[PDB]
Design a protein around this nucleic acid. Sequence first.
RNA 1: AGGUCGUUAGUAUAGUGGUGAGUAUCCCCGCCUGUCACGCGGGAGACCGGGGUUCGAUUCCCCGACGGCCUGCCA
Lengths: 390, 382
Amino acid sequence: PRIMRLVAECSRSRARAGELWLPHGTVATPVFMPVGTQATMKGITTEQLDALGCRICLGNTYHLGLRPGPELIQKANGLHGFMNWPHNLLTDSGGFQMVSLVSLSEVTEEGVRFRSPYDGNETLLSPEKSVQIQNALGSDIIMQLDDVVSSTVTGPRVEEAMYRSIRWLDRCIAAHQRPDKQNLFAIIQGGLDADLRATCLEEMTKRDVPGFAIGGLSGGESKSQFWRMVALSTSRLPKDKPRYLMGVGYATDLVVCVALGCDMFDCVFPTRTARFGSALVPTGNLQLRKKVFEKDFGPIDPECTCPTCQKHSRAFLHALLHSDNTAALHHLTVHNIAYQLQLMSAVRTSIVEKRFPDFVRDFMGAMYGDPTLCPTWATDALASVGITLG
Amino acid sequence: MKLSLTKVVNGCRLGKIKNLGKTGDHTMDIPGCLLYTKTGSAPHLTHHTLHNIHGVPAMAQLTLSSLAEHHEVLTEYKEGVGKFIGMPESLLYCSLHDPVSPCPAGYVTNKSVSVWSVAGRVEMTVSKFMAIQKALQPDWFQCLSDGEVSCKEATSIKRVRKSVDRSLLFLDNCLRLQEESEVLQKSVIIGVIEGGDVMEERLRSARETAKRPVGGFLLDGFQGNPTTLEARLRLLSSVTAELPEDKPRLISGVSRPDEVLECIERGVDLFESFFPYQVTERGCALTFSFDYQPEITSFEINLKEKKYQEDFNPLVRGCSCYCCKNHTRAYIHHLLVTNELLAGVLLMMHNFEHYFGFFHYIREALKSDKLAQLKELIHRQA
RNA sequence: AGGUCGUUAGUAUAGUGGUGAGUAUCCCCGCCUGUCACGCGGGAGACCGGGGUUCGAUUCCCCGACGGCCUGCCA
Ligand SMILES: Nc1nc2cc[nH]c2c(=O)[nH]1
Ligand SMILES: [Zn+2]
Ligand SMILES: [Zn+2]
């Protein structure tokens, strides 16, 4: 029983446009999903977020299993009841803590041992335990624990990680207990090596999984390797199931990768960058602490539609950010989430009515001005698939 | 201005002002509070969440200390301050310094006063003060005064006499300067009364200030330790005897629920509303009841304890705020211990609503004249 | 009127006749890709004015200004 239905597919490139059929309503692909780790979005009530338009949200396993712990969260009727959110949820496997908290833990074939970064206590996280606590949380898409290595390391470490991830995959498949209510997503590993990633694809395509996801591609690395790796991954994967690219969040990346056949995205950039005082716009961003925005009586963006871009001007936000009142950090957050949601919808409608190749030209023109000044890593990716601008 | 007095029983005035604002079309009840703001908005709230609060009053309260820095901008905007901060539908009152952060003593001279802003300390003469008032265009504004004597709690009579004379000079000068101009003529100006802890001064100040066409009065310097709460309560009833009975009375520094019920008894109209902010910033949640008909026992609960970790209940039964409709105590404890921002929002939305409810109830009860029962109910707890 | 005390970044406070004048806040740049994050680095910014004493003056003496306190005058 498939979970994805196709609606419209570009006849010039490989972009798609469809819809997911999840246990709490349905979502139109592509989609961007913001992330709130400790069972909240930072600084903003759920009614605001729901009214902005968003339809699926995130969570984390390590943190929630640490404090407050599985036992009472299960007694609070899962993370839907605990957080009070009537839409779809997606729960991460805690494998990213294996690269973020690198100098605080060790890993063996049995699991991983973590020393808490809030008080130095150590405990064990093995595939069975991770899958169990995720079963207690009760999400709509559940991810398998994998042995993540950094995308900046070499040596036989990558092969060990790949094979160990496969073995853990089979263990956690055997450990899964609610096959009907959750969708386990195999995670493709292999770093940046062609042969290793090909082997991984070939091997773990044979298992029965609802979906597939592409991992190990985040942070700082050459983009020339990045897009080639995504293009390799997309062709081998089947067409009846969604792809999923983890940890890409900027606008240019979203559009290019849509052209290359992705379906879902995740990042923490917009929310976190809001709390440092910066806003997102069709031309980049604004830093509302400089002196240049002190006497500027217009809106943030004339064409926007968020609650912030209709009442308040730039001058007022500048002046309010300089006090101790934190309400000025709950304005930027709303704008950035709205910004992100509108762009995906625009692209989707552009492709449904058979005009997608002309959306891209306009977007590049707006962002960089002359369409001949886009990043050289975007021209190659676009020209490979058929879309030619300039 | 138009004052109504439906009932005056046992020295407890009840009424409503009906002609105020631009030219009318606004009514304000008595007694009441004013919404407390930091540099524009309510603290931790934006307009969307602010309008989820029931029973927000119609007049707010700016502080000259917070807005004095951004002065060269409002002249360029040219159109007032309810339009700059995007609240263009309420009256405004511009007090001088906020009650939460006290002003250290020992800077007032016979030419200017001082106020403590974020960028530091700034002193202002008469001309600067009038220019700022012209630019802001608020409905009301308290005149430039001298109140440095509250800090000492004990001093020679010479300082107190000097203070009273200073304040009189300031009032006269500003009255003339405002009379001269044009734009300022549509804003009301209110008077200030002081004198320390002497009956003579507390009488002379009031007698001498009543003979000017100011539109209302301010009673300054009536807070202190609970060991002097009779010598700081007879003086008040002696003071409110030399003022015309047609203008509002304001009192600064009194916001606890227990002192208010006795400050109203000597005749007082309007109050600040900063106490719920204090009880929120400390991490607690107000829980005393004021329903008379049906911190010792319950005045606030502390939520960083351990007993509130497997507790699935609202903060207060029957509270109608957003927090008490959606979330539970466990979740707020989890938010507090793990150091989250949303905790402030969810607690402010509750504390403000509770306090406003209290003031509405006390006004209604005073209308029905059953203040003794409510006074006993409040006193038996804190 | 007379007597006495005081003056150091935009705004507070330590310090010395031989110190890059210390600290905390403002001001100015940079960083952010499924949260160790209302965060992390870096920079800039002062001894009231005048005269004398001293090898050397923010450090000792004299004058002026500004301000507080006391007395006198006055209420
Ligand atoms: N589990 C998991 N999470 C993330 C988040 C970003 N990258 C990864 C990855 O490779 N694995
Ligand atoms: Zn907007
Ligand atoms: Zn409540």
